[PDB]
Amino acid sequence: VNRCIFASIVSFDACITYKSPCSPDAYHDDGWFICNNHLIKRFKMSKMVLPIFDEDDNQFKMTIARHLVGNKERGIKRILIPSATNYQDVFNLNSMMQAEQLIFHLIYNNENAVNTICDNLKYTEGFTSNTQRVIHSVYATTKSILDTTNPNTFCSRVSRDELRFFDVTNARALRGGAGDQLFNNYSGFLQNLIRRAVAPEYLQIDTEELRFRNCATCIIDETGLVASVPDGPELYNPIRSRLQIRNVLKFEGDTRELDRTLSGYEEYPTYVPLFLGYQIINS
Amino acid sequence: VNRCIFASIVSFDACITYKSPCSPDAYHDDGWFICNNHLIKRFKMSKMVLPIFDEDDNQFKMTIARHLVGNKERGIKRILIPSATNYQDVFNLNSMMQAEQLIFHLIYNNENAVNTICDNLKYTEGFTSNTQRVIHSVYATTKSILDTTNPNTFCSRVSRDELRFFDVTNARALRGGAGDQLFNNYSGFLQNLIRRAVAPEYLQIDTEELRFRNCATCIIDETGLVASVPDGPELYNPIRSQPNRLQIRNVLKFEGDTRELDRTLSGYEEYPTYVPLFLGYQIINS
Amino acid sequence: STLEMTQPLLEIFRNKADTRQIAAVVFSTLAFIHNRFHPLVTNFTNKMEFVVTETNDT
Amino acid sequence: LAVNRLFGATETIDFHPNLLVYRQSSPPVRLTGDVYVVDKNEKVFLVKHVFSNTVPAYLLIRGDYESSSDLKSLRDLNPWVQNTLLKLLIPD
Amino acid sequence: PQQYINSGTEIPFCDDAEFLNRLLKHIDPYPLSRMYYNAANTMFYTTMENYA
Ligand SMILES: [Zn+2]
Ligand SMILES: [Zn+2]
């Protein structure tokens, strides 16, 4: 059994085959439905796991993603996610295959274009072929994924009080706030996706309220989410894999054998986390 | 050697599945520069020969086409070949492969081709990569082919006389018709396609005439070729005509019975039920 | 299993009104046997046919 | 029977599916009058008939039995016969 | 003959590997080795029951 939405992706013709397929995790159950391959490919992110002490080494764990954006690029190039307000502006959908553009119109509820292209395809030979039933199978899949209640299961729980606020804790980080109001207006599938991705800064428990990083990684953004440090210069995001300058005015660095001397010491990884706001959980 | 325009066509993609159907037409030699596969795919037509009759063995038979438009088709559906003003709407460009679209643009000879695509590709990884090389190479080959088709100038392939005519008398005789204007607007390539495809209902031999159909098969519009006739309804379109299966025939009492109704009828010649494209007029002189 | 088992196997023969399903099954069996003798999925003289004898005295 | 009610029988056979011969029949079959697809899948159909020009009834059939296009809808029929079918189909 | 066969080129097959493996597992327990000798004996009996 396999679940990645990008493995559910199909191509209308043998050429333009949807090759370079999903990461094998597509056989897993994760509730991302994106394979990590596609998550890298489309949005410059890679998912990750917080190990939580279950009051113990006992299993408590939470999902995370690092972003893969660089330190120099700005605006749209920093954008992580769009709104329907701008999803076409970000994707340049025409470059994309027709089923991809279709599925984006699904996510952003562009029923107009959806039905337009559906009606155009009806009489095409390849849509008298069961491409219709394929696309509506994808539809049904999403329908199940939101049959789990899009508001009630996702957040409007009867344990309603166990809420995530993604608003910035800092009272001076005032560009946040109504970003949480936007969150309600993003489609619930995406709300759930965020609820996966984003580590809280804090959690209230009946045990205690507790604090996990000093300061927030980014902020909520007014179209879709962006590499959005609350203040100051963008933090150096390194990159792990044309007639331009690439000067790096390095220190001379003659202290050879450094690694053979020090390697036992903790080799601090750098990839940016996703602390944001306050979760609440009963007991 | 290959001579189909479409054998040129290849594009950057993950795909290793290019579906090029290009028929024997490519290595045949009749200057269509397009395989029947595409005559089908885009243009819903079939290549034919008129067995031009001669008492001499030199029958000097002639190229022809016939269209495949279904009788149920309406308007744009019956439009065979749009004008530059209409093609972009007629065809699902973006669904069609990028380079194919671009090629269509160039066939229409629009600057907008380079205005748009040549810029638009800039961002693409393939534009960044050597594949730019292959792309523009195939482009240049296409340009060369177009220049070979170019009639416009004496420093060019085509020269001297012309004697075909079109815009033949309407029954209700509405004045004139810009069909030569459209003809000239169309690339001489398209004009050669018309020459390949379109029979005249009359041929005037130098000092003699012969006529071959009561009435024209096709009509022309400023927007494009129309698969229609001035009058009545459209003629009946000749309709387009291994695993285990549960349905296994029952025994019958081992009889052939009345062969006649199929036998003698098959002995009788069965009509070539097709829609040959007659539209226009031809003359000859010493 | 592909062959539209509307019925359990035995029911088929407990019926005698049919010949269709029976001959189909038989032919499929012969195909499988020949295939195991011959790693070459194939078809034969493309006419063959069958009869169910129905009397002890036949 | 369309309407009338049986009398005078003293014993009954219970329905069983095997009774419904799927006549292989000739490839072409042509039929007329009201037609109601019982099951496209099983090639089952119901058709109007009268005996002696006066005895309205419906006839079950199963097989090729191809007919005019004018497929009629179960909706239209009488509750009487509809109940009757509902049981007799025994989709249970 | 009681039937025709279309008798043209036909072969059936199926490929639902997971399905087939599911079948295999369901089948696993049976000591068929034992269980089928009696079947062969059935055919034997029938060989003489064939005639009285
Ligand atoms: Zn995927
Ligand atoms: Zn070609």
Swiss-Prot record, chain B:
A GO cellular component annotation in the UniProt record: virion component
Q: Which keywords label this protein?
A: Capsid protein, Late protein, Virion
> Which locations, inside or outside the cell, does it occupy?
Virion
> Which molecular-function annotations from GO does this UniProt entry contain?
structural molecule activity
Instruction: State the remark under miscellaneous.
Output: Expressed late in infection.
Q: What does the record give as the function of this protein?
A: Most abundant structural protein of the nucleocapsid produced during the infection cycle. The monomers are arranged in stacked rings around the nucleoprotein core.
User: In which family does this protein belong, per the annotation?
Assistant: Belongs to the baculoviridae major capsid protein family.
Q: What is this protein called?
A: Major capsid protein
Q: State the organism named in the record.
A: Autographa californica nuclear polyhedrosis virus
Give the shown range, full length included. 15 to 306 of 347
Curated annotation (Swiss-Prot), chain C:
Q: Where in the cell is it found?
A: Virion membrane
Where does the signal peptide begin and end? Answer: none
Q: What does this protein do?
A: Acts as a cyclin-like protein and plays a role in the modulation of host cell cycle. May promote G2/S arrest by interacting with host mus209/PCNA, cdc2 and cdk6. The cell cycle arrest is characterized by an intact nuclear envelope, concomitant with sustained activity of host cdc2. However, viral DNA replication still occurs in the arrested cells.
Q: What family, per the record? A: Belongs to the baculoviridae E27 family.
Q: How does it assemble?
A: Interacts with host mus209/PCNA, cdc2 and cdk6. Forms a complex with proteins C42 and p78/83.
Q: What is this protein called?
A: Occlusion-derived virus envelope protein E27
Q: Which gene encodes it?
A: E27
Curated annotation (Swiss-Prot), chain D:
Q: Where in the cell is it found?
A: Host cytoplasm; Host nucleus; Virion
Superkingdom is Viruses
Q: What does this protein do?
A: Required for occlusion-derived virus (ODV) envelopment and subsequent embedding of virions into polyhedra.
Protein name as it appears in the record: Protein AC142
Q: Which organism is it from?
A: Autographa californica nuclear polyhedrosis virus (AcMNPV)
What's the gene? ORF142
Which residues of the parent chain are present?
383 to 474 of 477
Swiss-Prot record, chain E:
Query: Where is the protein found, in the record's own terms?
Result: Host nucleus; Virion
Q: What does this protein do?
A: Plays a role in host nuclear actin polymerization by recruiting p78/73 protein that is capable of activating an actin-related protein 2/3 complex to initiate nuclear actin polymerization.
Question: Which top-level group of life is the source organism from?
Answer: Viruses
Return the similarity comment: Belongs to the baculoviridae C42 protein family.
Name by which UniProt lists this protein: Protein C42
- List the residue ranges forming a coiled coil, or say none: none
- Quaternary structure note: Forms a complex with proteins E27 and p78/83. The interaction with p78/83 mediates nuclear translocation of P78/83. Interacts with protein Ac102. Interacts with IE0.
